Write a protein that binds this DNA or RNA. Sequence first.
DNA 1: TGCTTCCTGCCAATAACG
DNA 2: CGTTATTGGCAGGAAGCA
Length: 117
Amino acid sequence: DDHYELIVDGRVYYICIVCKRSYVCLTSLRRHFNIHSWEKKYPCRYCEKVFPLAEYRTAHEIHHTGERRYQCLACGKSFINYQFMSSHIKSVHSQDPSGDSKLYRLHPCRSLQIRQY
DNA sequence: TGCTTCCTGCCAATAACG
DNA sequence: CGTTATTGGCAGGAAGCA
Ligand SMILES: [Cl-]
Ligand SMILES: [Zn+2]
Ligand SMILES: [Zn+2]
Ligand SMILES: [Zn+2]
């Protein structure tokens, strides 16, 4: 028992009973709620750190391996995450990768095992 | 104030369950 | 083994940090 529902204008919101954060879908509330309950743990496999979300652990573990998955297509430089890539493309190439063009390539993750696309 | 990490709608990949 | 439920990768804006 971790939420209540709030309905405004026919739109359904799921509210965390602990911190009152609002979610459009229940899956997100359940993913969020682990921060409170710590029902599941996500331990780094390279150090002692433990995370409340699987994706937080993954981003952290990529830091351990040093893999650079985000590649700028304008000059070929590669980056650890979206933020480094975006900062680069905006500052050096004066372009926005969230725009209407494909300015970067996200390589598959090869330095560790996560599900592929 | 420029890195560092967090956050959540969306949904493909994966697991659970008969 | 077909049907259903769950996980968690991803973008890219937000929040944290020193
Ligand atoms: Cl690499
Ligand atoms: Zn909460
Ligand atoms: Zn670690
Ligand atoms: Zn570049």
